[PDB]
Structure 1
């Protein structure tokens, strides 16, 4: 109408959207300047000006909203309520109106001020790339309901098991005597705490419940040991971690399950529950790891990638001066180019040599050499300007890079007074980047990366918006509420606080990396309410689990003589290899010389080497060493066999030469390492495993260039780290650790001049520290020591130079991007290799899938035995009792049973047990009723062929077995072990499984996993092989590393040490999960108190190689498992 047409001009004007983004950015700025640390009641100017600004902006929001309704209409598909974001904007408008009205009513209620945060979420709808990407995200969201329901499973079963096993157990500390005698001046707390403020509790084991810590393992205090008086332990006190990690209710159980899903603090609660209840709960935790934290979030990745592919194809289907010439020849020679490549390489090498405590001559050598190289660069660029011409020289901008580099270099050389030696030296490092100019394959790799990041930029902006929203929200809820209590007289703010926006964003980023996030989780749950964990759960999910998988989807779719018998000798030698593995599994360094097992170990080694050399001789005389083609060593696996048998022989020889064992100890070490490497021939002796290893190796070459690029970035950033931090990673550790600046003051206090294990003195330790930093673990501490770093030889101060945060965050983003590129490259390469197959052979099954259709034509109607049932008093049973109208009733019964098991908790009222037992009796009754209805509905045939009625009968039979049990204890008929009752109660949970009948998506997804079982099972066998090999290496390398009070352990607490072989397996498993593994390195590399040669040996040269290789190989194997599952899912999706 005409009144509508009056306002059309402005609303359709793009200037209106631009100024709306202007006011959105103003809103982001206004939300930025909030200071919950200082903004008490807004009795300051800036608070008032921000109130004025956001009042004006709210006025603008109201006017623009009302105009755009009155110019577009209301309540219609075309009207204002057409897009979701318009409805959201109306929601902001109404919420702000309500909050303003309440403010006029003089009620603060800072819970509607928790809506101020949601305002920057308005930006998506008016940014086109963002709007499209977010629309695709939302449209592919509804197809994650299946992974959400399976997540409901993995939480619910494990949570019920947890709440029924360890209900309130975690509480029990070791108390004093009930009637204790003390003369006076009672400084003894009621129970025992090793650390102050219950930092590391000492959860006992109740009498009768066989834990491990039974109050007689307490550390003897070091007169008299008062601690021995902490005798009896009961279950009344606060729970571990300031009452945040316990199995009291089901909410806390779900929090614990969430914590172990994200792989942080895992070992701590693992050891807690071991201490409390039983030694055999690592079974529960390992099954939970394997099921949830690996086969689920990776299934979430698979679902995101696949469904994003289909929804993208969907909308796709919707729209569907004579010397000048002479001097040229010297340039384009490809030989002087090689010379200047050697020059640049040696420049990078020299420029990397510099380390801490430089020899005085050496730094002069480096500066002279830098002058020489700069003169050389000046030489060839003064050459190129004339021989080619100015326009020709600028025709390639790489020459412009070179000119800029030399100009900066010469300015630095001129800068011998001040200034230049601070930053221009740091900018010298770009000369390394000159390599891309002449290494050609990287040009293709870099341009591919650029074409990919053409899509990433919008997602990167989306990440900034998302992090901003949650940082502001956390600021609103947690601002000034992390006041960590004093330790020297004043309330020290925790470094992981929310008191200011810079720390808010860096802390949200920390949380997103799943690194020491449980610390702030507890520190937030201890302040407001146990509901504050919903914030971290929401952030973790809507970050890592639905958005970063969206990134991967974006990338992948952007890419888109003597007689011989050989019957079962392989089988028998494989068995012998298994026995060899068994005997490798016992060399833990406690066997005293001359032991019976020692002798058995040695003789077994002798015999097994004899058998291996015998089969060596057999298979060579069948072939011949090198005698023509198709000889022995034409296959690498046979080559490996020969290598390992030869090194075993020389091991035996040197062992027999034990006389005069001086100066051959290093030989003994290397031979022990190699015989630990020995159990690998299974790949040769196993066809499927061999094919798998070939797939691993062949799949690595395509991402070889990406690996080289990542190594180059590691090197360059290591040189950055050396340039910035040289010897600033020193801190005076002491009881005071205050009011002192330099090492002289520290030695005056005589505390210690501690030098960190992760530091940038040379380039090598810089590379190790960068590998840890890029590993998303222990990176917070490195970042802290970076920010706090001040200068060469004095105390770091809290947040001395915050700008290093930019370096430390840029490194994570770049390395994460390169690892993501590696993953997507593996996926696409495997896809192309796969793509040939379904082109090749799947053409042959499409001949038979319609044959199966012809098979179903036989199935039309074989006079099914429905006619037998009717008129036999079961005329309605066969039909009316088999309809969906009664199956949903069973589903509702099961939901009721679920909510009943969601109620048990510690100190539940008596009426609660009575009601729960009544509900269980009702539920088992109705289960028996439906079972009988089925039994009369059909005869014996469906009882077994259904493949479900057996499960139903098992469920009802366990239920009826259970109901008989408490009847025994009501009349005290017979003493029943409480363990039996506990087992019965905890396995009543199996009744949940019947939803799989109704949840067809669960069937589909789990089956899709199942058809990939061969490849992933072979990969799992390979993964166990890798664990075994690295376990043997660890046992022989780090066997003598003792853990005690004299040797403080940060990574290996009690069973994570390298003494025996089982503990080594556990600690390799812990390393493979990226939890405190950098702590394990910090422990293993340690200059000891000269008590053993292991600390003083060359361990520093080898242990980082050990852990780096293990982390890389384990992550690669898991990545390929994920790729196999994803590819099977795509194959099924095409079908």
Structure 2
């Protein structure tokens, strides 16, 4: 109409969208200036003027809303409320309206002011690339419901188990005697806490509960052993971590299960449970990690990638002067280019040399070397501008880059006064970048990287919007609430606080990286209220398991003589290895020399070596070593076996030379190390593992380019880190650690000059620290040491140099992107391979698939026995009583049962327990009722043919057994061990599995997993084998690292040490998960007090290599498991 026609021109003007986006950004800026720790009551100039800007923004929002409705109409597909984000704009408009109205009413209500945080979210529709990406993501969400209901299963089952088992156990610290006698001066705390004010508790075990720590393992204080008086322990006070980790409710159990889903702070709470209740809870925690933490979130990645692929396909288908030439010859000589390559390589080698307290002569050598190299590069500059000419030089901008290097280098040489020495040295790294102009494959690889970034840009902008929104929200609800109490006289804020928007963003990024996010969780959820964990859950989930899987999907979709017998020899030699491996699983460095076990191990090694050399001889006489083709050494695995047997012979010969053991000890160490590799012949002597290892190696080459690029970035950033930090990572750890500046002041107080173990002195330690950063573990501590570092030899101060965040976050982001593109590379390769075959086999299956269609045509009607069940008092059971309306009843009763076990908690009112008992009776009776109905519906033919009614039978049998045993303790007929009742309550959870019948989508998803078990099982066997090899190596290497008070460990706490074999197999399982593995490495490389040669040994050279190789191999094996599942998923989606 005419009134609409007045404003359609303005509202449809792209200028209107431009000014809209501009006011969105200005609103974001006004939000950013919030200072919760400083902005109390808004009694300042900045506060009032920002309130004025927010008023203006609200005015503009109301104006744009009203014009858009009057010009587009209301409540219709073409009207204003047609598109989602128009409705969202409506929502924030009304929210601001009510906020302003309540502000007029003089009501503070800092619970609706927090709604402002949704305002930046309006920009999502004002950028078309963002619009289309978010539209696709929203459209691909609704197919994600299946994995989320799987999430509900694997949270609810374990939460019920936990609340039934460990309810309230966490509380029970260790108290004093009942009628205790003290002369006076009451300093004895009510219970015992080893560290001040209960951040590390001493959870005991009640009498009657078989815990492991039972209040007689307390440390004797070091006079008067006051601690020994802590005799008995009863419940009370608070659960551990400021009342944040417990299993009392089911909400708390869900919080804890979420924490161990993120694989952070895991062994801490596992050891709480072990302290309190039983030693056998590692089964509970490991079964959760394997299922809940790996087969769950990676199923989310698989489902998101697959569904996004098909939604992209769907939307796509919807559309459906003379010597110049002479000198030119020397330039492209194919020998001069390699000469300047060698020049640049030795230049970067020279650059990496410098370190802390470098030799006085060496720095002069380096500076003259720099002069030589810049002179050579300038010579190349002049010769190339001469033989080519000014225009020919500028034709390729790589020449421009080289000229830039030349000019900055000569400027650095000239700039010897000030300023230049601080920065122009730091630009020397660009000289390394000249290699790309030479190496060919590293041109196409970077080109395809840029092709990816072409689309990754919009996702990156989306990510920063998301992180900004959540940082604003956190800074609201947690603002100035993390004030850590006094420690040296003042309440120093936690470094992870939310007080300033800079710290808000860096803390939200920290949490997104899942490193020390539990510290923030506890320190926040004990500040506001226990419901504050929903914020962390929403952040971590919506970010990590949705947006990032979206990024992965974006990349993946973007890239589109004598007699010889060989009948059963392999199985028997595999048996012999099993035996050898259980001979290898016992050499703990604690068996006393000359014991029965030592002798048994020696003789077992003797016979096993005899058997293996015998089979080696058999094979070689069958084939021959290298005498022509098809010999013994024409295959890799035979070469490996020969290598192992040769090392075995060397070891036995040297061992028999034990006399004169001086100077050969290192040889013995190396020979033991190479012994531990012997459990690797299974791959050769088993077909599936052999094929899988070949497939791994084959998939390893197409990602080689990215690996080399990532290693180059590691070297570049390592040299950069050496440049920035030289010897700044020294801090005066003492009783005061205050009012002291430099080493001289520290020695004045005589405390100590402690040296951090993760530093940037050398380039090797630079690479170690960079690997720690890149693996998202313990990187916050390194970042704190980086920001705090002040100068060469004095105390770091808190946040001295907040600019290093750029380095410490840019490294994480770049390394993370390279790792993501490495995965995406594995998938593409594998798909290409299978797709090439696939169709061939599947064609024949489709020829058989129509036969299966013909098979169902046979199935039409074999006179089903409904009539025999008709008129026999059950004409209604078989037909009217087996309808879906009778199964909605069963599902509803299942949900009521779920929500009624979801109500148990510690110290519940007795009335609630009685009501739950009555509800259990109700539900058992009804389950019996439809069990009998189903049994009368049909005889025993289909009763054993359903394969699912048996599940109902088992459940009803468990339920009736449970209700029957309840009577036994009503009448006290027989003394029943409460363990039986425990098992029965905890097993009542089996009534949940009845939902699987209706959830056909979950059935399909779990199936798609199930027909991946060839590859998945072979990879799992490989993974166990890798743990075995690395555990044996670790036991041999770090076996004797004593952990006591005088050697305070950081990561190997109680059973995570390497002493035994299994105790090391656990710590390998812990390192693989990436929880406090950096702590374990710091524990190993630890100079001791000359108590042992292991501490003084070559640990520094070999411990980091051990840990890095293990972490890389474990992660790669897991990636290959995931890609196998994903390919089978795409194949199933094809059919």
When normalised by structure 1's length, the TM-score is: 1.00
1:550 alignment partner in structure 2: 550
Corresponding residue for 2:941?
A: 941
Q: CA deviation at 1:844?
A: 1.1
Q: Distance in 1 between matches of 2:707 and 2:183?
A: 70
Distance 2:26 2:962 in 1: 65
Q: 1:750-785: CA deviations, max 9, x gaps?
A: 111011110000100000000000000000000000
1:240 Cα deviation after fit: 0.1
1:964-1016 residue CA offsets vs partner (Å, 9 max, x unmatched): 11100101100000001000110010010000000011100001100001110
1:386 CA drift (Å): 1.4
- Partner of 1:1049, secondary structure, is coil
Distance 2:192 2:290 in 1: 36
Deviation at 1:940, TM superposition (A): 0.4
Question: What is the CA deviation profile of residues 107-153 of structure 1, one whole-angstrom value per residue up to 9, with x for unaligned ones?
Answer: 01011111111100000111100000000000001111101100000
Equivalence for 2:722: 722
Tell me the CA shift for residue 941 of structure 1.
1.0
The equivalent residue for 1:374 is 374
Is 1:695 paired with 2:718? no
Partners of 1:208 and 1:53 lie apart in 2 by 66
| 1:839 CA displacement | 2.2
Give structure 2 stretches of 5+ with no counterpart.
none
CA deviations on 1:911-931 (whole Å, 9 max, x unpaired) are 011000000000000000000
State the partner residue of 1:919. Answer: 919
**Residues 1002-1044 of structure 1, C-alpha deviation per residue, up to 9 Å, x if partnerless?**
1000011000011101100110000000000000000011110
Which position in structure 2 is the counterpart of 1:66?
Answer: 66
Partner SS, residue 1091 of structure 1:
coil
How far the C-alpha of 1:480 sits from its partner, in A, is 0.2
Q: What is the alpha-carbon distance in structure 1 between the residues aligned to residue 679 and residue 152 of structure 2?
A: 41
| Offset of residue 309 of structure 1 | 0.2
Aligned residues: 1135
User: Deviation digits for residues 30-84 of structure 1, max 9, x if unmatched?
Assistant: 0010000100100000000001111011101111110010011001010000101
How far the C-alpha of 1:585 sits from its partner, in A, is: 0.3
Mapped to 1, the partners of 2:365 and 2:184 lie a distance apart of 72
Task: Report deviation, 1:1052.
Answer: 0.2
- Once the two structures are superposed, residues 223-274 of structure 1 have per-residue CA deviations (whole angstroms, 9 ceiling, x without a partner) of 1100000000001111100001000000000000000000000000000000
Partner SS state of residue 792, structure 1: coil
Q: Counterpart of 1:613 in 2: which secondary structure?
A: helix
Residue 938 of structure 1: how far off its partner (Å): 0.6
Q: CA deviation at 1:842?
A: 1.3
2:136 maps to what in 1? 136
Q: What secondary structure is seen at the aligned counterpart in 2 of 1:683?
A: coil
- SS of corresponding position for 2:197: helix
1:757-815 C-alpha deviation (Å, 9 max, x unpaired): 10000100000000000000000000000000011000000000000000000000000
**C-alpha distance in structure 1 between counterparts of 2:186 and 2:955, whole Å:** 57
Aligned residue in 2 for 1:1090: 1090
Give CA-to-partner distance per residue, 1:511-565, whole Å, 9 cap, x none.
Answer: 0000000000000100111000000000001100000000000000110110101
Which residue number in structure 2 is paired with residue 39 of structure 1? 39
CA-to-partner distance for each residue in 1:391-432, whole Å, 9 max, x for gaps? Answer: 110000000001111111111100111110000100111010
Secondary structure (helix, strand or coil) at the match of 2:813 reads: helix
SS of residue matched to 2:263:
coil
User: Residues of 2 paired with 1:381 and 1:319: CA distance?
Assistant: 53
| Counterpart Cα distance in 1 of 2:445 and 2:618 | 48
- The Cα offsets for residues 70-100 of structure 1, whole Å up to 9 and x where unpaired, read as 0110010100001010000000000000000
Q: What's the CA shift string for 1:892-919, capped at 9, x where partnerless?
A: 0000000000000001001011000000
Output one character per residue of 1:688-721: Cα deviation in whole Å (capped at 9) or x when no partner.
0100111111110000010000000000000000
C-alpha distance in 2 between matches for 1:969 and 1:459? 61
In 1, the alpha carbon distance for the partners of 2:400 and 2:32 equals: 40
Question: 1: distance between equivalents of 2:22 and 2:534?
Answer: 33
- Give deviations 1:801-830, integer Å, cap 9, x for gaps: 000000000000000000001000001101
Structure 1: distance between partners of 2:344 and 2:888 = 74
- For 1:238 and 1:257, the matched residues in 2 are separated by 19
Deviation at 1:14, TM superposition (A): 0.3
1:637-695 CA-partner distances (Å, limit 9, x unpaired): 00000000010000000000000000001100100000001111000100001001111
Task: Output the CA distance in 2 between the equivalents of 1:987 and 1:1015.
Answer: 33
The whole-number CA distance in structure 2 between the counterparts of 1:406 and 1:104 is 66
Q: What secondary structure is seen at the aligned counterpart in 2 of 1:197?
A: coil
**Structure 1 residue 566: Cα displacement:** 0.8
Partner SS for 1:546 = helix
- Cα distance in 1, alignment partners of residues 897 and 351 from structure 2: 69
SS at match of 1:36: coil
Cα distance between partner residues in 1 of 2:986 and 2:1013 = 29
- Per-residue deviation, residues 1096-1118 of structure 1 (Å, max 9, x unmatched): 11100000000000000000000
Q: Shift in Å at residue 3 of structure 1? A: 0.9
Which whole-Å CA distance do the structure 1 matches of 2:930 and 2:613 have between them? 66
SS of residue paired to 2:114: coil
CA RMSD across the alignment: 0.5
**How far apart in 2 are the matches of 1:535 and 1:199?**
23
In structure 1, distance between residues paired with 2:28 and 2:390: 47
Distance 2:346 2:1118 in 1: 38
* SS in structure 1 at match of 2:281: helix
Superposed displacement of residue 167, structure 1:
0.6
Q: 1:614 & 1:537 partners in 2: Cα distance?
A: 60
Q: CA deviation at 1:730?
A: 0.5
Matching residue of 2:1060? 1060
Q: Cα deviation per residue 1:317-355 (whole Å; 9 max; x = unaligned)?
A: 001111001110000111000110010000000011001
Aligned to 2:243: 243
3-state SS of paired residue (2:532): helix
For residues 755 and 728 of structure 1, what CA distance do their matches in structure 2 show?
A: 10
Structure 1 residues not aligned, in runs of 5+: none
Moved segments of 4+, more than 6 Å: none
Q: Distance in 2 between matches of 1:16 and 1:405?
A: 46
Q: Equivalent residue of 1:702, what SS?
A: coil
SS in 1 for 2:684: helix
Partner of 2:324: 324
Question: What is the match of residue 734 of structure 1?
Answer: 734
Alpha-carbon distance in structure 1 between the residues aligned to 2:239 and 2:571: 54
Instruction: Specify the SS of the correspondent of 1:494.
Output: coil
Quick check: 1:270 aligned with 2:300?
no
Q: Distance in 1 between matches of 2:1118 and 2:363?
A: 46
1:584-634 deviation digits (Å, cap 9, x = unpaired): 000001111110010010000000000000001001000000011010011
Residue 771 of structure 2 corresponds to 771
Give the Cα separation in 1 of the matches to 2:231 and 2:190: 11
Q: What is the match of residue 521 of structure 1? A: 521
Cross-structure match for 1:653: 653
Corresponding residue of 1:1034: 1034
In the other structure, the counterpart of 2:745 is 745
C-alpha displacement at 1:838, in angstroms?
A: 1.2
- Structure 1 distance, partners of 2:634, 2:700, is 22
**Aligned with 1:889: secondary structure?**
helix
Matches of 1:177 and 1:80 in 2, distance apart?
73
Deviation at 1:876, TM superposition (A): 0.6
Deviation at 1:840, TM superposition (A): 2.2
Measure the CA separation in 2 of the matches of 1:562 and 1:804.
Answer: 71
| 1:400 counterpart residue number | 400
| CA distance in 2: counterparts of 1:700 and 1:189, whole angstroms | 60
Is the partner of 1:681 in helix, strand or coil?
coil
* Whole-angstrom CA distance in 2 between matches of 1:76 and 1:166: 55
Shift of 1:178: 1.1
| Residue equivalent to 1:535 | 535
Distance 1:489 1:804 in 2: 29
Residue 752 of structure 2: SS of its match in structure 1?
Answer: coil
How far 1:381 moved relative to its partner? 0.6
